[PDB]
Amino acid sequence: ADYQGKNVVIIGLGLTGLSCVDFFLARGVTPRVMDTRMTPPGLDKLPEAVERHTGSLNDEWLMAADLIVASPGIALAHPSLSAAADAGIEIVGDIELFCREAQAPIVAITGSNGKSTVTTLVGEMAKAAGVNVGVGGNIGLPALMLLDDECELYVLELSSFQLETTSSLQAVAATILNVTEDHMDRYPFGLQQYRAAKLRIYENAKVCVVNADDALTMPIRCVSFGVNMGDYHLNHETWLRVKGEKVLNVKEMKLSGQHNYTNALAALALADAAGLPRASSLKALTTFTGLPHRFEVVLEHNGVRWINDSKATNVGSTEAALNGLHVDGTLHLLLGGDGKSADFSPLARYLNGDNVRLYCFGRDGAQLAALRPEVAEQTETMEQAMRLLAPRVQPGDMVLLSPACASLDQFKNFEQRGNEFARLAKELG
Numbered sequence: 142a143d144y145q146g147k148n149v150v151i152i153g154l155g156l157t158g159l160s161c162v163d164f165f166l167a168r169g170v171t172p173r174v175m176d177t178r179m180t181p182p183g184l185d186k187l188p189e190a191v192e193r194h195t196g197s198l199n200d201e202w203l204m205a206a207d208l209i210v211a212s213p214g215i216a217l218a219h220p221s222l223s224a225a226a227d228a229g230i231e232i233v234g235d236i237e238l239f240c241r242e243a244q245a246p247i248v249a250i251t252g253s254n255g256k257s258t259v260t261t262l263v264g265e266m267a268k269a270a271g272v273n274v275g276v277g278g279n280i281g282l283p284a285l286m287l288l289d290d291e292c293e294l295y296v297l298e299l300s301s302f303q304l305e306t307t308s309s310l311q312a313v314a315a316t317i318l319n320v321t322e323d324h325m326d327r328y329p330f331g332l333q334q335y336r337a338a339k340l341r342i343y344e345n346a347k348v349c350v351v352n353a354d355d356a357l358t359m360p361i362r363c364v365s366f367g368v369n370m371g372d373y374h375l376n377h378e379t380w381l382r383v384k385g386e387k388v389l390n391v392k393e394m395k396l397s398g399q400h401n402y403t404n405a406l407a408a409l410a411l412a413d414a415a416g417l418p419r420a421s422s423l424k425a426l427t428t429f430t431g432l433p434h435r436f437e438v439v440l441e442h443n444g445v446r447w448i449n450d451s452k453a454t455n456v457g458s459t460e461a462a463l464n465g466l467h468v469d470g471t472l473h474l475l476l477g478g479d480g481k482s483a484d485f486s487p488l489a490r491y492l493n494g495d496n497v498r499l500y501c502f503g504r505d506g507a508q509l510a511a512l513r514p515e516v517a518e519q520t521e522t523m524e525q526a527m528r529l530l531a532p533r534v535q536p537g538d539m540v541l542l543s544p545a546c547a548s549l550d551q552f553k554n555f556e557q558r559g560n561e562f563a564r565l566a567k568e569l570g
């Protein structure tokens with residue numbers, strides 16, 4: 142698009158907002174930027190010339206705007222933003238701005254769990270084929286920072302928040318990996334509203350890739366992946382298959398776990414649709430080792446594995462860690478933080494038996510301990526929980542941080558939570 146001479150207002154002085162400020166300045170447009178936080182993190186990095194407003198949204202600025210660029214961390218339902226929308230003021234996000242500018246095909250990936258793994262895998266598959274690939278989005282690198290005339294393929298992890306404000310995405314291949322309750326603090330019309338945000342990813346996608354085992358991933362035809370069903374499916378040793386043909390024995394993969402094998406199927410389906418050679422795509426599957434904070438063994442010592450799964454910020458993710466988990470002794474499970482109004486009940490079925498202890502902390506600690514009080518301890522912080530469990534740990538035990546919650550009540554982000562866990566594990570283990 143052409144933004145020359147438009148009154149542009151950006152909401153958010155985080156990573157996204159700073160990238161948008163630069164995007165507009167490079168195009169001869171000086172935006173104004175606001176943030177409801179009194180002392181937002183990006184204040185220091187904001188150029189001196191750019192007007193900024195903190196501590197609230199500025200309605201004088203909003204209602205004067207020709208274009209509002211809303212960071213994914215502000216709800217469109219915010220009264221100030223809904224007022225602007227009612228006035229017919231255009232509201233977009235950074236992913237929208239990116240789509241308007243991108244000059245290479247985009248693979249777009251969302252879902253309640255697995256989306257960083259699949260995004261990274263597709264990136265690895267592209268690299269294995271010698272394709273100049275830009276990987277970013279919700280995974281951490283703001284999409285506008287990917288824009289590159291030499292880029293041949295973009296792979297974007299997209300949150301439901303980012304999808305709400307995106308209207309111009311025409312993916313070469315798009316997927317919703319799964320939909321499980323998350324972000325209910327942002328979705329007062331519940332699961333179907335959350336789902337509706339994710340379903341936007343399929344609009345004008347060349348190929349849609351759905352989860353045959355999760356009907357909420359389906360639009361209302363798509364390529365499918367699944368365990369026993371799907372164009373891409375598993376054949377049990379376990380094999381990855383594409384329509385009945387064996388393509389990879391998963392003993393060649395570094396990743397393990399059935400949910401990671403279906404993640405590999407999703408990645409391969411997207412890579413196939415994007416036109417990458419299957420051979421090099423399969424190669425990438427055999428080399429990829431995983432992501433930080435995603436069921437990451439940070440210490441294995443004295444017959445105990447200490448596993449950082451801080452990236453488990455919802456119940457579905459912690460289920461993926463627990464479902465089929467083999468532990469030789471006792472599982473010491475750390476749960477807690479901001480549960481975002483989730484129902485934690487689905488976890489209860491994994492918490493039976495003589496060999497599970499729960500250490501619950503943060504905002505929703507009490508609600509988590511309530512899953513099975515008789516084997517639960519509640520503390521205020523994760524450090525207190527660690528120092529509590531550590532003396533009790535015996536050879537053969539597992540210590541698992543898979544907290545089923547956001548970290549943001551006590552931590553900067555889930556990476557900080559994971560780093561602190563790994564530090565404490567190395568101290569106490």
Ligand SMILES: CC(=O)N[C@H]1[C@@H](OP(=O)(O)OP(=O)(O)OC[C@H]2O[C@@H](n3ccc(=O)[nH]c3=O)[C@H](O)[C@@H]2O)O[C@H](CO)[C@@H](O)[C@@H]1O[C@H](C)C(=O)N[C@@H](C)C(=O)N[C@H](CCC(=O)O)C(=O)O
Pocket residue numbers: 152153154155156157158175176177178212213214215278279280281282283284300301302454455546547548549553554555556
């Ligand atoms: C909230 C959000 O969507 N964050 C994504 C965003 O980062 P950013 O630095 O630009 O974020 P932001 O829009 O400034 O908001 C950051 C925080 O400031 C708050 N904020 C923001 C603007 C404002 O005016 N007022 C305000 O209070 C937001 O509510 C949020 O708590 O843009 C980056 C590049 O695209 C993303 O990598 C990053 O993803 C993260 C990891 C994330 O938080 N994503 C969302 C989907 C989310 O809620 N994830 C959490 C993680 C919790 C945790 O880390 O423990 C979760 O609940 O799963």
